[PDB]
Design a binder for these strands. Structure first.
Ligand SMILES: [Mg+2]
Ligand SMILES: [Mg+2]
Ligand SMILES: [Mg+2]
Ligand SMILES: [Mg+2]
Ligand SMILES: [Mg+2]
Ligand SMILES: [Mg+2]
Ligand SMILES: [Mg+2]
Ligand SMILES: [Mg+2]
Ligand SMILES: [Mg+2]
Ligand SMILES: [Mg+2]
Ligand SMILES: [Mg+2]
Ligand SMILES: [Mg+2]
Ligand SMILES: [Mg+2]
Ligand SMILES: [Mg+2]
Ligand SMILES: [Mg+2]
Ligand SMILES: [Mg+2]
Ligand SMILES: [Mg+2]
Ligand SMILES: [Mg+2]
Ligand SMILES: [Mg+2]
Ligand SMILES: [Mg+2]
Ligand SMILES: [Mg+2]
Ligand SMILES: [Mg+2]
Ligand SMILES: [Mg+2]
Ligand SMILES: [Mg+2]
Ligand SMILES: [Mg+2]
Ligand SMILES: [Mg+2]
Ligand SMILES: [Mg+2]
Ligand SMILES: [Mg+2]
Ligand SMILES: [Mg+2]
Ligand SMILES: [Mg+2]
Ligand SMILES: [Mg+2]
Ligand SMILES: [Mg+2]
Ligand SMILES: [Mg+2]
Ligand SMILES: [Mg+2]
Ligand SMILES: [Mg+2]
Ligand SMILES: [Mg+2]
Ligand SMILES: [Mg+2]
Ligand SMILES: [Mg+2]
Ligand SMILES: [Mg+2]
Ligand SMILES: [Mg+2]
Ligand SMILES: [Mg+2]
Ligand SMILES: [Mg+2]
Ligand SMILES: [Mg+2]
Ligand SMILES: [Mg+2]
Ligand SMILES: [Mg+2]
Ligand SMILES: [Mg+2]
Ligand SMILES: [Mg+2]
Ligand SMILES: [Mg+2]
Ligand SMILES: [Mg+2]
Ligand SMILES: [Mg+2]
Ligand SMILES: [Mg+2]
Ligand SMILES: [Mg+2]
Ligand SMILES: [Mg+2]
Ligand SMILES: [Mg+2]
Ligand SMILES: [Mg+2]
Ligand SMILES: [Mg+2]
Ligand SMILES: [Mg+2]
Ligand SMILES: [Mg+2]
Ligand SMILES: [Mg+2]
Ligand SMILES: [Mg+2]
Ligand SMILES: [Mg+2]
Ligand SMILES: [Mg+2]
Ligand SMILES: [Mg+2]
Ligand SMILES: [Mg+2]
Ligand SMILES: [Mg+2]
Ligand SMILES: [Mg+2]
Ligand SMILES: [Mg+2]
Ligand SMILES: [Mg+2]
Ligand SMILES: [Mg+2]
Ligand SMILES: [Mg+2]
Ligand SMILES: [Mg+2]
Ligand SMILES: [Mg+2]
Ligand SMILES: [Mg+2]
Ligand SMILES: [Mg+2]
Ligand SMILES: [Mg+2]
Ligand SMILES: [Mg+2]
Ligand SMILES: [Mg+2]
Ligand SMILES: [Mg+2]
Ligand SMILES: [Mg+2]
Ligand SMILES: [Mg+2]
Ligand SMILES: [Mg+2]
Ligand SMILES: [Mg+2]
Ligand SMILES: [Mg+2]
Ligand SMILES: [Mg+2]
Ligand SMILES: [Mg+2]
Ligand SMILES: [Mg+2]
Ligand SMILES: [Mg+2]
Ligand SMILES: [Mg+2]
Ligand SMILES: [Mg+2]
Ligand SMILES: [Mg+2]
Ligand SMILES: [Mg+2]
Ligand SMILES: [Mg+2]
Ligand SMILES: [Mg+2]
Lengths: 103, 44, 77, 94, 61
RNA sequence: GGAGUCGGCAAACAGACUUUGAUCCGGAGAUCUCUGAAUGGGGGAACCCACCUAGGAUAACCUAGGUAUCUUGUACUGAAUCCAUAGGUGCAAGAGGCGAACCAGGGGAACUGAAACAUCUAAGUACCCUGAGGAAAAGAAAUCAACCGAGAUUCCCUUAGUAGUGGCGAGCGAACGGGGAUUAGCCCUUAAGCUUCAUUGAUUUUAGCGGAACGCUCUGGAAAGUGCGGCCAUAGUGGGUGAUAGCCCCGUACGCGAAAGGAUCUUUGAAGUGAAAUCGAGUAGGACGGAGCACGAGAAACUUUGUCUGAACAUGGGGGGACCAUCCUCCAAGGCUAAAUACUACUGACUGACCGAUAGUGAACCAGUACCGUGAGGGAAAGGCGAAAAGAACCCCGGAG
RNA sequence: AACCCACUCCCGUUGAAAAGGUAGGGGAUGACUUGUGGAUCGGAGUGAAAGGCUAAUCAAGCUCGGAGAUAGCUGGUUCUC
RNA sequence: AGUUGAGAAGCUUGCUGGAGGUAUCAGAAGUGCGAAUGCUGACAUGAGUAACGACAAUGGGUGUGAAAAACACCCACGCCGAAAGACCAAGGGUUCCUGCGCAACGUUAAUCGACGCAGGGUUAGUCGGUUCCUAAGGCGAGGCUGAAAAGCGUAGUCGAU
């Protein structure tokens, strides 16, 4: 089971945005994630009149590696690793420091 | 000047064709020796 | 081919040695002829390509018994 | 012919400027059909589905154009065509 | 069209179920030829429906 | 299982799929065009033309089955010819083709060496052909030894480059006897064993599950790196994350897991086989021509056979390197038998004082491809932006270059 | 004349062409010329016979194997004192 | 670039480069290249030289175009006409037509093209095949022969020219 899921609450560790918070938007393959509000780029695309039209300069996020973010423990307010807890009938993700469920 | 290769598809299929190699065991080993090299053509 | 029906003898190979001891390949062939044998329990002649040594066996063991051996081993004479 | 084959013989109308001229001046329609469709099958299928009275069908086989690319020489699919002649006045609408 | 719902019928009214899809598969190809098709996914979906009916139609014996 | 997905080059634009469980992974099942042993008949492979039966239409057909040859058994029938033999039909079961090496046979070179060359060597090699199996073959003394004894076959080390053999030239080359790997014998007054089912249990295999421990500071685009202090260990020289990570991620040590298929070892019921009937006759021995034995006719014993002959019956027969006498030791002309042994086209795991794009496979890339040849056949070149496309909006010269 | 052939000169020889061209030349109802399909081949085929031809290769084709044949013969053999 | 040794060589630094290197002493070599008419790529000299492929032959006007000796049209010249015209077979396989193009191909330029891209185009009871029949020849149930592969051949069934 994935430790970092979609629509999570994470925090950036390592990278230029080290210390920012956001929510996971897209979980790309080959271990890359799109986290809202971090790693912003500007893309310049020719608005050629051929084949309709196109945009100019755009702002959008750029995927960063999956090992550069961690779950935010919003009780101690710091990055924590996670584990998988014994099942009543199903696995649940829990924090390593406090052994408490994450949602 | 007349050159050596004067094409014809009927005389091509009756000498080098698939059904001409499968008639004799000496031509059946040409096919096996070509299926082992990995050829894509394998027959004229 | 040149194989005795009742004994299975077939051609073999060997050498010719000249006085200077030159060796060349050769073959030894069985001495086999066609011959009709009277079969009493069938009232007709049966023709076989048997060797001369195969006739000595037929004379000794009989012909009805020899034909039985050929029948068992799938010989169509 | 089994009713399963009835729907598997016609593939669609053929769109061209020559087909549009025939559909007006001679009441003749051009279709794309299966490569193993005989003239008898096409005649029965057009009447069965479209509810018309076809009078004659001709047929021709079209080769696949061969195109050149950096990785070799690829070619398209051979297909079949049929000119279907209807009665003097009626439309082969869908 | 789940195969569970398909086993609730009989061969007599499954064969008309297969004929109903042949209309639908044909009509969608007539629209595609003229270019006035908007529901492009329906081509690949109808193909799967016929294959499933023919699957169950083989299990009755 | 647990949330994304509609394979890649290869990106884009639409249509969609779903926590009422998708894509994905494993077991089983269904469908499985045409050609190819190709098998209804032909044929220039991927094409052409049919027949019979059952069912369905009414027009110019549809659906499902079958129809090659040969071998074996069986039922019917029936030529010269009276009877029956050959033959002709219909049924059942089996074979056919492919595959790198290994195995047992059939046929079988030459270059070369001898500083020439014939006998000899290379060599029973290369090559061609035929069968079988996961192994094959050989196997239970008509064997050796030497008057003391051993005890089926197969493989390894010695004996030993020794005794022999050889235009006694170049060369070829044992055995006896020792040390080991393996352990096993049983039948023709019918056995061990081997198959195929039906059972009694166990173990593996085809997917997966959990899996411990790091904070602060400096340089820097980015910290894993500097400095300071901790924690985990049956897990510390694994891979990669924006530079060098036991504690960031995937893993690792270590424990768990199979609706259902495959395999193995297991007890006991059955059927079949072993299987040749009754201890071995055209057999042992002999003459001529060959082959094999380390042994090339040599004092040349022994095995085998193309031609021709040809015994005795346990007070009998074979062998002990010409031959004879005496002693010793075995019982041929009927069979079955595991392990130790050979190989790897194929799959998995780990490793390397192996290569790092003229190297390593011919081939890191859409390579047995492009290209060359009528064909068999021959056979290339060609890797790297950046951490992330953020791959250069907009203006000017220029042919809307 | 067409068609088949190739006696002379010159050009061309890195050619327009790995055997031609322009001028003349021989046969042109025959032992003639030609299309299509078929048969014979490597110590073998075929030859009105030149050892000629058998896919631009012939006093023994091409291809892959024995094979890295053999070479008392040429050539080459890499840093320092 | 400077410097140190008798030599193969060593060391210290400036610039480029952007992630790996290996002191000392031992251990293994695919361990040192100017030659082999050596092998593979790249690049020189000849040299801006020979040649631009039948010596039927071209001259103006207009148009398009960034740009016309070569493109399209018009007037006027030349050449073939038992072909240098038209049509079948073999062989080839989209070279056919239209719209948009000029990087490369065209022995020069190109607005043109048998060139690039994308669409379109081949309609049969009588034409040519297939189905029917056979020639040379091929294969060939049984059969005869042959170490094995296999050879020949009967019934038969393929094979047009
Ligand atoms: Mg021929
Ligand atoms: Mg070719
Ligand atoms: Mg010899
Ligand atoms: Mg037609
Ligand atoms: Mg295709
Ligand atoms: Mg078939
Ligand atoms: Mg056939
Ligand atoms: Mg057939
Ligand atoms: Mg077989
Ligand atoms: Mg032999
Ligand atoms: Mg020799
Ligand atoms: Mg020597
Ligand atoms: Mg010599
Ligand atoms: Mg010598
Ligand atoms: Mg000599
Ligand atoms: Mg020899
Ligand atoms: Mg087997
Ligand atoms: Mg055995
Ligand atoms: Mg015995
Ligand atoms: Mg022994
Ligand atoms: Mg004793
Ligand atoms: Mg001498
Ligand atoms: Mg896990
Ligand atoms: Mg962990
Ligand atoms: Mg690490
Ligand atoms: Mg950290
Ligand atoms: Mg038996
Ligand atoms: Mg006996
Ligand atoms: Mg005995
Ligand atoms: Mg004897
Ligand atoms: Mg004798
Ligand atoms: Mg002898
Ligand atoms: Mg001898
Ligand atoms: Mg001597
Ligand atoms: Mg004898
Ligand atoms: Mg004896
Ligand atoms: Mg003796
Ligand atoms: Mg045995
Ligand atoms: Mg390479
Ligand atoms: Mg490099
Ligand atoms: Mg290469
Ligand atoms: Mg001519
Ligand atoms: Mg001549
Ligand atoms: Mg002359
Ligand atoms: Mg003159
Ligand atoms: Mg003349
Ligand atoms: Mg002349
Ligand atoms: Mg005259
Ligand atoms: Mg004359
Ligand atoms: Mg003629
Ligand atoms: Mg021949
Ligand atoms: Mg000759
Ligand atoms: Mg020649
Ligand atoms: Mg020769
Ligand atoms: Mg010779
Ligand atoms: Mg050649
Ligand atoms: Mg050649
Ligand atoms: Mg050599
Ligand atoms: Mg050799
Ligand atoms: Mg030298
Ligand atoms: Mg770096
Ligand atoms: Mg590194
Ligand atoms: Mg070192
Ligand atoms: Mg070297
Ligand atoms: Mg050099
Ligand atoms: Mg030198
Ligand atoms: Mg050189
Ligand atoms: Mg030179
Ligand atoms: Mg120059
Ligand atoms: Mg000059
Ligand atoms: Mg000059
Ligand atoms: Mg000049
Ligand atoms: Mg000129
Ligand atoms: Mg010229
Ligand atoms: Mg020209
Ligand atoms: Mg002009
Ligand atoms: Mg002008
Ligand atoms: Mg001109
Ligand atoms: Mg004139
Ligand atoms: Mg054609
Ligand atoms: Mg083209
Ligand atoms: Mg054109
Ligand atoms: Mg144009
Ligand atoms: Mg230009
Ligand atoms: Mg140009
Ligand atoms: Mg074109
Ligand atoms: Mg016919
Ligand atoms: Mg005939
Ligand atoms: Mg024949
Ligand atoms: Mg036969
Ligand atoms: Mg016929
Ligand atoms: Mg015919
Ligand atoms: Mg004809």
């Amino acid at each position: 089971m994935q430790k970092i899921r979609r629509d999570d609450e994470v925090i950036v560790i390592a990278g230029k945005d080290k210390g920012k918070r956001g929510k996971v938007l897209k979980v790309l393959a080959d271990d890359r994630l799109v986290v809202g509000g971090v790693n912003l780029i500007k893309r310049h695309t020719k608005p050629n009149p051929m084949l309709g039209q196109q945009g100019g300069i755009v702002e959008k996020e750029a995927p960063l590696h999956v090992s550069n973010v961690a779950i935010f423990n919003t009780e101690t307010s710091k990055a924590d690793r996670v584990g998988f807890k014994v099942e009543d009938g199903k696995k649940i993700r829990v924090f390593k420091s406090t052994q408490k469920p994450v949602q | 000047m007349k050159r050596t290769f004067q094409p014809s598809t009927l005389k091509r299929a009756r000498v080098h064709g698939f059904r001409a190699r499968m008639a004799t065991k000496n031509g059946r080993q040409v096919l096996s020796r070509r299926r082992a090299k990995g050829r894509k053509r394998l027959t004229v | 081919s040149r194989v005795c029906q009742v004994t299975g003898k077939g051609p073999v190979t060997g050498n010719n040695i000249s006085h200077a001891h030159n060796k060349t390949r050769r073959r030894f062939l069985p001495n086999l002829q066609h011959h009709r044998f009277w079969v009493e329990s069938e009232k007709r002649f049966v023709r076989l390509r048997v060797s001369a040594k195969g006739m000595r066996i037929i004379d000794k063991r009989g012909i009805e018994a020899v034909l039985a051996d050929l029948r068992a081993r799938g010989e169509k004479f | 012919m089994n009713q399963e084959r009835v729907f598997k013989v016609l593939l669609g109308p053929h769109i061209s400027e020559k087909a549009t001229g025939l559909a007006d001046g001679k009441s003749q329609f051009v279709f794309k059909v299966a490569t193993d469709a005989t003239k008898l099958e096409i005649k029965k299928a057009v009447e069965s589905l479209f509810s018309v009275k076809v009078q004659r069908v001709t047929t021709l086989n079209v080769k696949g154009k061969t195109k050149r690319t950096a990785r070799g020489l690829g070619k398209r699919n051979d297909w079949k065509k049929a000119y279907i002649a209807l009665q003097p006045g009626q439309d082969l609408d869908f | 069209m789940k195969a569970n719902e398909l086993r609730e019928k009989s061969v007599e009214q499954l064969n008309e179920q297969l004929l109903g899809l042949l209309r639908d598969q044909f009509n969608l190809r007539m629209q595609k030829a003229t270019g006035q098709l908007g529901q492009s996914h329906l081509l690949s979906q109808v193909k799967r429906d016929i294959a499933r009916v023919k699957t169950v139609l083989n299990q009755q014996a």
